Amino acid sequence: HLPNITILATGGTIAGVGKVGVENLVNAVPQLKDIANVKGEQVVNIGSQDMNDNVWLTLAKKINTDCDKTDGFVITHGVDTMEETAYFLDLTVKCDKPVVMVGAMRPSTSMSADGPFNLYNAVVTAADKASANRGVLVVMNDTVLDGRDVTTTNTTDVATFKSVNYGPLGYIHNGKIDYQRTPARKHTSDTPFDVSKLNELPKVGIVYNYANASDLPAKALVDAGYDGIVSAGVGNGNLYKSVFDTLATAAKTGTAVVRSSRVPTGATTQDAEVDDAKYGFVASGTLNPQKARVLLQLALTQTKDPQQIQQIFNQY
Amino acid sequence: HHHHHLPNITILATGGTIAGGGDSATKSNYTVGKVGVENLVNAVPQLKDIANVKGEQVVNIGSQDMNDNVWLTLAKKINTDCDKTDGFVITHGVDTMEETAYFLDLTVKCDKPVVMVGAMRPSTSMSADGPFNLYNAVVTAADKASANRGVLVVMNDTVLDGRDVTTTNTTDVATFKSVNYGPLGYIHNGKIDYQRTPARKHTSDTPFDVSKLNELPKVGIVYNYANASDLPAKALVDAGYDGIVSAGVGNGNLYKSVFDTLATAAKTGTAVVRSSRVPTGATTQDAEVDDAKYGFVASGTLNPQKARVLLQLALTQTKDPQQIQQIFNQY
Amino acid sequence: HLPNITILATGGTIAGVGKVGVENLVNAVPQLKDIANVKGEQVVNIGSQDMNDNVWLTLAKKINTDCDKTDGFVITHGVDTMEETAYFLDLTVKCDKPVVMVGAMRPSTSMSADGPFNLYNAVVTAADKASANRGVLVVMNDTVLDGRDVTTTNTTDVATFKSVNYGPLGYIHNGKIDYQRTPARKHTSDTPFDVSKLNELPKVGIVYNYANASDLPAKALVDAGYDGIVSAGVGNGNLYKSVFDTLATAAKTGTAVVRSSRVPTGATTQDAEVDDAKYGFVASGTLNPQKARVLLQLALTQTKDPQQIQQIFNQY
Amino acid sequence: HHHHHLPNITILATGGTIAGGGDSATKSNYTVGKVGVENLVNAVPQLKDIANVKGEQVVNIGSQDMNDNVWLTLAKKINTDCDKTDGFVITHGVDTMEETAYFLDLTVKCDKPVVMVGAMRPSTSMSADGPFNLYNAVVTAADKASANRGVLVVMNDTVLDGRDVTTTNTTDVATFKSVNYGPLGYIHNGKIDYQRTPARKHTSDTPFDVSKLNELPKVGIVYNYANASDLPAKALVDAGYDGIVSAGVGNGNLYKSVFDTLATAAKTGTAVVRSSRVPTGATTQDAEVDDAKYGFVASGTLNPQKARVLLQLALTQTKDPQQIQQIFNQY
Ligand SMILES: NC(=O)C[C@H](N)C(=O)O
Ligand SMILES: NC(=O)C[C@H](N)C(=O)O
Ligand SMILES: NC(=O)C[C@H](N)C(=O)O
Numbered sequence A, C: 001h002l003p004n005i006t007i008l009a010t011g012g013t014i015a016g017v018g019k020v021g022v023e024n025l026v027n028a029v030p031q032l033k034d035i036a037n038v039k040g041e042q043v044v045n046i047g048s049q050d051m052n053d054n055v056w057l058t059l060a061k062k063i064n065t066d067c068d069k070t071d072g073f074v075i076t077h078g079v080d081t082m083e084e085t086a087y088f089l090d091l092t093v094k095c096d097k098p099v100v101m102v103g104a105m106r107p108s109t110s111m112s113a114d115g116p117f118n119l120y121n122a123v124v125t126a127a128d129k130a131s132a133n134r135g136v137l138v139v140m141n142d143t144v145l146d147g148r149d150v151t152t153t154n155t156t157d158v159a160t161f162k163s164v165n166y167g168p169l170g171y172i173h174n175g176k177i178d179y180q181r182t183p184a185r186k187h188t189s190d191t192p193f194d195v196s197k198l199n200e201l202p203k204v205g206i207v208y209n210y211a212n213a214s215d216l217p218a219k220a221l222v223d224a225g226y227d228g229i230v231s232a233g234v235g236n237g238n239l240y241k242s243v244f245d246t247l248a249t250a251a252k253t254g255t256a257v258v259r260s261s262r263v264p265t266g267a268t269t270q271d272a273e274v275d276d277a278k279y280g281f282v283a284s285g286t287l288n289p290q291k292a293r294v295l296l297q298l299a300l301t302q303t304k305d306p307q308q309i310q311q312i313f314n315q316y
Numbered sequence B, D: 001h002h003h004h005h006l007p008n009i010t011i012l013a014t015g016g017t018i019a020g021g022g023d024s025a026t027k028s029n030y031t032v033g034k035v036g037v038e039n040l041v042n043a044v045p046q047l048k049d050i051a052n053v054k055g056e057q058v059v060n061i062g063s064q065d066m067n068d069n070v071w072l073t074l075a076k077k078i079n080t081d082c083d084k085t086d087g088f089v090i091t092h093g094v095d096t097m098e099e100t101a102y103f104l105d106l107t108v109k110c111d112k113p114v115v116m117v118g119a120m121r122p123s124t125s126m127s128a129d130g131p132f133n134l135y136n137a138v139v140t141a142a143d144k145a146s147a148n149r150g151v152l153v154v155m156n157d158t159v160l161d162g163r164d165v166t167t168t169n170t171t172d173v174a175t176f177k178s179v180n181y182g183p184l185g186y187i188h189n190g191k192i193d194y195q196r197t198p199a200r201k202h203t204s205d206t207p208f209d210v211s212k213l214n215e216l217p218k219v220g221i222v223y224n225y226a227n228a229s230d231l232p233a234k235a236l237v238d239a240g241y242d243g244i245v246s247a248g249v250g251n252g253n254l255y256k257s258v259f260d261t262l263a264t265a266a267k268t269g270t271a272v273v274r275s276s277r278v279p280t281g282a283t284t285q286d287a288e289v290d291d292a293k294y295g296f297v298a299s300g301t302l303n304p305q306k307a308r309v310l311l312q313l314a315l316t317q318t319k320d321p322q323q324i325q326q327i328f329n330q331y
């Protein structure tokens, strides 16, 4: 009569980076036995700054295969790219049981280390039946956050993770969650992305805009035949002239182009300064560049047509 | 008896959505840098209550196309014309305002106020924000208390320092905030209560002298993410870039491929600054990267585009990584 | 084939305060004709700092009676207590057609006045069929906010209104709304509060906590036989000792007592420092003191039992 | 040769959740001011690396029960013991920390650092925040650069000035922020980069001298909302209160009943300060209230509880509304 919860470990400073094994992490929080029967599996043990497509595909297939063997999943992970992995799993996971990602800003051995209570709260969330069907979740700093909107907002603050556009789903207090929101964007088993038989993802890179931006990064991606390029635009997804010329070319030359923004909140919109339809570009909406990459890679497993890509960007 | 005299304020116009226009008041489509400075001034009839305004159109572009030559033209003009006026307002686009503001913060030697201003809605839109913003920027440039605070950005009733200020939202009129150390002052009824001033050295306290420069050192920016390509970094290194700024993940970390390329580059004398794609907080020393070992510099609270500004200026004085680190600790 | 939209005007600086009539407000935004057929009715013309129970009851009955005559409602109102009126209507309105509140930080005649585009955007929201069944809404600064969580965060900023705990429902760009959230708390026709035949509300006052707080405010409410007292507590709804003693007494003497917090975000929780069950107190959750008053007044039309009041505070 | 010497730092303990305890590491129930200062110090073994720490238990309460007499005891103690130590940390509850911090900001004359610190989780909870907060507060009190910045609050790796600092969330360890003008500095690896200092007069630049005072003037706070009762205001007026602070709606506005009672009061010599229940921004002059006419004072960015602090101190010098307004413009 306690839930069966699986911890899939990937590394991160919660395990510091990526040094301590999943068994040690579990054993260091003996109160986990008050709330669940926890089984731990080591996927990788890396800093999430070196996170990659192979790990993503591994996690998605593992969760999908092992869904009916457990009541919920907790994924221990680095902070740096937690928001990218959360969103990838948000779109590719077909288990509608809770999938909860957790990290830590401080290691196990630092004063006032945040990882133990973080993990406790992540298991609370994975064990709550109300957590189901809300898509892939990130639990940090007593807060339950959806995988699409969650992002890291500060380089060192324990309270870094926030859903900056649409806000959190619930707060955790005394091992209980008052959920007041759920993501409306289609997730998990409401998406067509199916990664079960894929061993690589389409090649998508990210270029930065700023004053006097060089076009050389964008050119190097075009020259390598990248499947897609996300622009981290200025303001409402705008492009420096040199970058705009190279991306205009890419989009008529077999590279899907998504305009996102370096600006940390708000949508990159259509109908502003850029005629997306004319250039064949897709506007990313509230997806930031790293998140837009995620969805563009997945869109590219279904289609190369920019009109169909924009439609994906409007639904997921 | 004495007579009140209004300060002389010069508007240097560069374009931006503040000078943007579209064919409907109620649709979001517009084109930028289309309206001249005279039109802007005459849309704020009340400016005569507070200053004698003169405008000059320096260029008329979207700030998405801001570039080194416009930066050099502005700094030189302000430094040359200092004695001719009581203060400057610069009308500018939002997109790269935080870059131009910091460049000018480090290169203007005039110690009269320099205030930048823009708008999130075009001049043609319903409830356009540009008119009162411009009025507020003139208030600020005319205020004796505004002097010696460095170059300023005024937007949404708030006076922000050019170092910390950044745009936080793609569309919101409240977008501009000093996200680490906060604003200098708030404006109500044409009056400012200043409660802060930036401690970092600016303006006539920096060594950066652009008066004779006709170009700036080449500095590129590369982004980090999961499975990040090393191709952008390599392209910058193949082109002989003087510097590269890394938009790192978390506290300025790098994907291993990117790290490898930049370490190699730094050993051949490319300056490499670690910054962060994360929108607030410092990229610190003494975290996961041994900067001393690789010859890297940590950007502190400077975001990637701002670190590029200081790196380009740093490279005009020195190519030594320890001396560049000290610059990033002082300015 | 454009929606029929009714503007119910109450005053505020949008009409500055409370001086200009609803007809003038409408006529000043001739682009409203592009999106709706707008009919205006004047309810009152007051600064919302003088908002009161009679106006609330008027609005609720007017909307409920006139529901089937129109496609949506826009309510022009002052900023100062917009969050209280929004929440009252959120709980008492039985029309599930859009009800949208709007104000302005600057008058009609000030430079860059915010009221015209505010009103335009509020009519856009009231005319969108997707706006229906999300409860009573506040539209300010291109943002659609639920009436329960919305509050004013700054004394003068045009961007003051924010849903500080759970975030907005959607952003408005180019006359279109991308809704990604809806309130989970029960609203409008999912609440039992029925105000149709009520001409007054239970008497509920608010006392402030701080260092060395006087108990005299709380005593004056008890001495007048108030139906309820909301505490604006310190931190997690805590009470200064003198105030705590007087409120302990009130709760065993015929006055319902709700602990809220002066702190602008986060829940006033049970199971912290205060034994609510023992003192007969109710914890307000994320409802701030003025919002907790709203719900406590309505709870008092159904019940005086603190256990039943806490249950109301956990559902609405 | 020379030897490193560690600064002498005094911990004045007052209680708070930092000294709180509960029977489980994982339940939220706790009771406050239960654990003595010695226990706190010994839970941070690394404090010896940075200071010679001495603790004194001044009182042991929840800050929800903070009061004038504790404020007087603290200020007098700090001012008396200044020469005996290199800096002070005050362990304190969160709930009213922003009030005590501003009181001390206006009454300490010691110009060695005074740093307040607390915790959002009790000392017994999993991942308790108190230990590193205390470590960080000692870092800050030991840092020469911390002097002459006024009284400070250190929480969540951030150094905040006692005037602007407030608690923003009921439970979050990140709750403390300077919501109008931002923090002074951030702490990483035991080091602070200070980029701001408060312009408002504090400490030895104020006239407020509490050395001989054994009480403070009586100042109450009343809240405004729709249909607000005048009974609280009247109760304060019936008790002969020296001052009343209004927690107004929006920009410090009052419900008409409340307005009537306070106007009447002010005409009989009660000091009335308009503040706001809204969590950020100034209560300004020159808005909907004619303050001159009624003899009211506008609080600026001071929230109601902070305005009470300055009003009580103001009332020790003057009962004149124009002179009280000038105090609220300067401190
Ligand atoms: N706090 C952390 O987890 C940062 C670490 N670099 C990681 O992302 O793996
Ligand atoms: N709001 C704006 O000004 C955006 C415009 N693209 C600019 O930066 O010039
Ligand atoms: N901006 C405003 O609407 C404030 C005005 N006092 C009101 O609430 O009616």
Ligand SMILES: NC(=O)C[C@H](N)C(=O)O
Binding pocket: C235, C238, C273, D015, D016, D017, D018, D032, D061, D062, D063, D064, D092, D093, D094, D095, D096, D118, D119, D120, D121
């Ligand atoms: N977090 C805390 O310290 C709350 C406690 N009631 C106090 O203020 O003493």
Ligand SMILES: [Mg+2]
Binding pocket: B001, B003
């Ligand atoms: Mg004359």
Ligand SMILES: [Mg+2]
Binding pocket: D001, D003
């Ligand atoms: Mg010796």
